[PDB]
Design a protein around this nucleic acid. Structure first.
Lengths: 93, 96, 106, 81, 88, 69, 79, 97, 96, 82, 102, 92, 109, 91
DNA sequence: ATCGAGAATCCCGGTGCCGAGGCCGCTCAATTGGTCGTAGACAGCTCTAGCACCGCTTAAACGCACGTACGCGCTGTCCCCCGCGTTTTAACCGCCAAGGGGATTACTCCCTAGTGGCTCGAGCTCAATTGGTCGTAGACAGCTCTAGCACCGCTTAAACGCACGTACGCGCTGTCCCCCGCGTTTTAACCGCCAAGGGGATTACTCCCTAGTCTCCAGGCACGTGTCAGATATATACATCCGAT
DNA sequence: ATCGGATGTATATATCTGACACGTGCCTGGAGACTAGGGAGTAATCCCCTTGGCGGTTAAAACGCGGGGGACAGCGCGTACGTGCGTTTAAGCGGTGCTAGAGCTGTCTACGACCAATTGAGCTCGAGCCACTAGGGAGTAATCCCCTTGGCGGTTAAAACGCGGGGGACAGCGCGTACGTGCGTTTAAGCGGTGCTAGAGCTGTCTACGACCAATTGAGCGGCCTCGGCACCGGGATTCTCGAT
């Protein structure tokens, strides 16, 4: 009976950035479609970019060069920053 | 007290650009989708969410086409949008 | 000891564990490294936060406390980078930016 | 059991669509022209959808078939499924 | 000389001089990476791409011009073509 | 070096593209267009080299950079 | 280059007519070209390698017939 | 305004071309194909004409045999128009794919 | 409850494609081979390795032919294999 | 009990072989048809095989005669005497 | 010449040389090349008869490739022997699928 | 610069079977490629089955079992007859 | 003038496969009058290579099936799932090997 | 009564030391090496004969490997072969 | 660019409702820890090939001037779209229930965990290695004349694009064959042990056959030649196909 | 089936040209002849693996049967493909360079065959060590209930529509500007190379790091209830157009 989404996490981020505002159901579906879409773009480019280089593993390097490919300009910088900072905040277990 | 030609028009442009609702009536579009769908398979049902996806797509596509067509019309030093413009727009868009 | 979620070690709201599962199941690779899902989750959270701030300020600017589709559309279509990223997408129930060609004014 | 419904896309509706698109004056032979364009667009999105639905071996096309059909046609749609 | 359309439309050979284009691609590349080398196959691939893109844009541009009841291409037309093709 | 792409060449292209007459302001304009196209494709190409631990841009990198368009 | 499309549609139609087919769908004309290309790509690839082992620079008819024979398609009339 | 029933000059052509015994592709476009295709595998090859004609005889024979097999697949599905489904089934059964 | 037609069939497909053993009963096939061989030469012995080589060959050949036949059947928009399919398949194969 | 052994190839056996080939529904006139094709396939290989053992002036068909016959007729077989 | 002792037109001496020089064996028996010559002459003669009558029935006097193609492809055994072979300039047997006739 | 072929012999047999008819050059090339091919078949198989029985000599027995392997049916029978006839006349 | 210790050419080449046997087979196989001295080390080297390729693929294929031996089925799974190797061995049948699991999609529920 | 069994076992224990091989799989393996041997030697002999040379050297063997083997196999094999020959010539 | 009129929107305060949002109970997807086998990072080497730079013709870029096409703005006629009031239509709401059909559940089958053949050493033997002789393939360089590219002018077959209409592809519908699932009944496959011999395999023994070498010559290859078989050009004769009776 | 009435192919009739058949001249190879010696033939014998032989159990084949799902035929439509015509295009025939290189040559070194003897690797032979009864997953048939389809009943928003008159489409016109062209000048691309070395692409080695496993649990999800944020309304306040001048 259960079907998954990203709704609780975009609510978490939403209350992180705008504690006062909320969100309607449709806007929630837009956000979830956005997260799924950008996920499939990044993972797609990462898989193809692993294949071109004949390497059988998707690493954080593939994700970051894919992120440099899909995102335009300054976004790709912040994305590359957050993504790497988080990974180090994870490496020190 | 008539309104000069061309002022109620852009009044409507402001109104409908500020609005967000679907602009073609629901049941006619629904029956259109059903009649079109009968060609590829006859016994087809549609989840209401599905026809609503198809209408959001349709109206979005048509407003984008209409703005591009408006650009062509203005490019021919005109204010009246006419099939010349739409056919040029879908020609360059590659929509054939 | 008592288990923590990878998303918390990463400092993220988005689910690193889910992202990993989706990466593996979708057969994008034979094998997925351990930093991939935490990175990808981090970027999804970043973009999510970007659109959610801009939309937040859209709704706030419009005397409302709730983000509605139109607020997300105003958010993206007025931001060059997002509008490029989301150039060939259509925000359902979002409408279009108010714009009248100057030649059509009186 | 329906036919001739392309005329059901009323002229005021098309007029509104043009108004949202920023059009001020609209020629009269467009209203039919637009209908033509609309039909073929829809004819494709639906046809694509059905193959997705037929692939899932169902008898109702779900909104995901619409969204997949559009995504293949380079017009991704947010808010459904 | 409408023959120029005849001749060059029938042709299948590069229309921009190779090595000037080579320095163009090299200068453009200096922004993204320092001391890039290019195998010739690559520069010829992107030059062929360039030529294809430019001829397609030029056909669309001529369609805009003809639509405006002119015969000479003007920046109006190229910008109109790129603003409906989905370009910047 | 953007002005290396010469007027007879832009001409040869517009004629290849079936153009009768050409306003003189086109050239710089089309030059600009060319730049951005190159500026984009080239960029993607080199990020396919940077990811491949390479310093030369191979032709595969430009065909992958091209299909990204 | 880009020579494949140079094998005209009427030609393909003729080959088909010799093969005894009456009515032919249009998407064959592209399909067949593909089918031809890879086929040719194989035999020619063999032939040139036969040339390269022989330290020559002209592909002879014997390289073609050897290529065809080693691909299970023996050809009579050239040596 | 004499018109032949659709289908008449078609098999008229198949009768003609089956009794014929000549190459069916223009030899110079075919030669340009052979030259460009070979150009990838080695640079500036020369070709004795007998060789290029060997390759055309082989090519045309292969294509007419494939066409009879595909035609057989087409009629087996109870139509008369050959379409790429037929070609792909035929090559998959002969072991080419 | 009872199984719909065509379910135990797919169970057998999964089972035998995952399986790797000979599917023809050993001794009937053995005397088949011996009877066939008596036509070409009389008073023959067979080392067991030989008849088992012939059975591995026979069964492999038959499963490959059956896949091709299934492809012909599916190509005619059917699910049932019929001699039309076998004859078409080993005609494209060139098996006279 | 040596004559008519082509009938000894039961309908279930053929059915299994077909299932391994991935077929779901099987018409009945195949059970005879397949028998026929098998009879001829086998008829060829043994013939080749027998001539090989007839050339070596022996009286037992060896496994090498079968594997050589199978290669000779374009169906190489791995696992029996190399 | 040995070919005359054997009673054949084909060259026993040439075929013998080919067997020895040809990477088939080390020692070549004495009866092998005359047997092989005999068989090559036999098959040659058969297809040359069928081709002969094909050309003659075409009212042309000289055997052309097409005549060899009709000769081979219309004879069951010969068609099998030369199955994966391609007779250059030979064309195909006239054959129209019956379902396609008018 | 001297390149041998089988042309003279296929012409001799051709006049044996049809003295009035002749042969084109192209058909001659098909004939010579054909005899070369069948030679390669018979000699190849003869060498292989000589190698299978440890024997090191290709004799008429290897040629005839090879011709039984390669030639189909009545062709094979008639061929084996011709070969034995030629060998027997040669021996005397 | 005593000899040197006999060392095998197969070891000089750095191979497990027998250069000496391969050489003997080349000469005795009536392939040529003369076999070059570097030919058998080349041929042995390639035979060992392909052996290694299919033998690894089969080995870890069997290890996925949680078994300590390689059985025919494991090497056929190795061969038929590798595009190049399957292409090379498209005309052979691994006795006791079975077939790759695959059900035509139209036949699934 | 020889075969290639010991060498394929040596290669096996070189690449996967824990796993072993059944007799049947062993016959599949050496039957495979025998077949591929006859392929390479066959093409080498044919193209040595075509270019009217009486010696099958490492040059013919490599063109045979290029004709028979597909793609990267033919590349990787060629590396082994040439490297082996060099390791043999210097030793 | 005024002023009154006044029409349309804009705005604000009230009504009330439906979904946003949070507690909750809970289930199932994420976490946890240790092996271990291998993907990939990294380093170094081989030699490709990328790069910067040489001059030299000549193709082409370039700089004017000239005169002409074109486009751009102005004007007159006029077609047809806009705005609006009045009638006409069918959309919308909500609600309703029946039920299709997709979701969810309860079995059931598969697929594992658990309680004889293939590796290892002792004793030969047949083949691989050694190293020195000897005879020849073939490595190598070059001279020649074949023959493969390259271009070109004319003709004219053939590609090509397209207009038109029917014939075929494709789906949809109904019916009835006939295949599958499944339980019962009926064979005959498989298996169990065992020995007698056929026939394959070894061995040993002499001996017929073939390779190999040389000299002789005639049979077969390379050109040259002359011509008639077939090629090409045109006309007629005849076999068709189309439609209508 | 059966006339006319076109259409297109086959055949015929004329002419001619070049591919084929035969001589001419040469030269490489096949034919005798001869001995050695090595593989082949033959005998006896050794020994293994093929063949039988018979019942007993029971795993599987055969059989029967109910239904259900799929083959298959008939029909209806729409549109893809085949025919046909006129225009365009480049192919192909013919005949010309020119020069890359296929093809033949001689020569002298390498290198690979050949042998004897020598040893060890690989073979063989024997010995001995590594089915049931649960519980998750995967399909799958039954069953649950959610969500699609269709009806009520209107009223009422929204489509239709009809009409005049305002304005924008558009066609022409005139004129001035700013492309196009042509020809004299130049310049730098292109091209055959050399000189150098960064790096690419490949191999080898070693480690770090992800697959992989059930067992546990707490994060997230379906359900459920509450309440305020937000849509909607009415009527006034603002602003924004319109006309006349």
């Amino acid at each position: 009976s259960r079907k998954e989404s990203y709704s609780i996490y975009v609510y978490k981020v939403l209350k992180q950035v705008h504690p006062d505002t909320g969100i309607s159901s449709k806007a929630m579906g837009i956000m979830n479609s956005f997260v799924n879409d950008i996920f499939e773009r990044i993972a797609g480019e990462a898989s193809r970019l692993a294949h071109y280089n004949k390497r059988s593993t998707i690493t954080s390097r593939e994700i970051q060069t894919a992120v440099r490919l899909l995102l335009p300009g300054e976004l790709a910088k912040h994305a590359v920053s957050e993504g790497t900072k988080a990974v180090t905040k994870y490496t020190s277990a | 007290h008539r309104y000069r030609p061309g002022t109620v028009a852009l009044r409507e442009i402001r109104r409908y650009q500020k609005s967000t609702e679907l602009l073609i009536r629901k049941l006619p579009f629904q029956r259109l989708v059903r009649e079109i769908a009968q060609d590829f398979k006859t016994d087809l049902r549609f989840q209401s969410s599905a026809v609503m996806a198809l209408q959001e797509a349709c109206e979005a596509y048509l407003v984008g086409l209409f703005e591009d067509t408006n650009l062509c019309a203005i490019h021919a030093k005109r204010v009246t949008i006419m099939p010349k413009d739409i056919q040029l727009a879908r020609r360059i868009r590659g929509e054939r | 000891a008592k288990a923590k979620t990878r998303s918390s070690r990463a400092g993220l709201q988005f689910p690193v564990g889910r992202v990993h599962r989706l990466l593996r199941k979708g057969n994008y690779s034979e094998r997925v490294g351990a930093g991939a899902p935490v990175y990808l989750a981090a970027v999804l959270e970043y973009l999510t936060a970007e659109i959610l701030e801009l939309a937040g300020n859209a709704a706030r600017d419009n005397k409302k406390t709730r983000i509605i589709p139109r607020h997300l559309q105003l958010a993206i279509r007025n931001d060059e980078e997002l509008n490029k990223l989301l150039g060939r997408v259509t925000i359902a129930q979002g409408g279009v930016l108010p714009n009248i060609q100057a030649v059509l004014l009186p | 059991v329906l036919r001739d419904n392309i005329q059901g896309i009323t002229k005021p509706a098309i007029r509104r669509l043009a108004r949202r698109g920023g059009v001020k004056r609209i020629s009269g032979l467009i209203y039919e022209e637009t209908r033509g364009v609309l039909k073929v667009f829809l004819e494709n999105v639906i046809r694509d959808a059905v193959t997705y639905t037929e692939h899932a071996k169902r008898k109702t096309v779900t909104a995901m078939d619409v969204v997949y059909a559009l995504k293949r046609q380079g017009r991704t749609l947010y808010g459904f499924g």
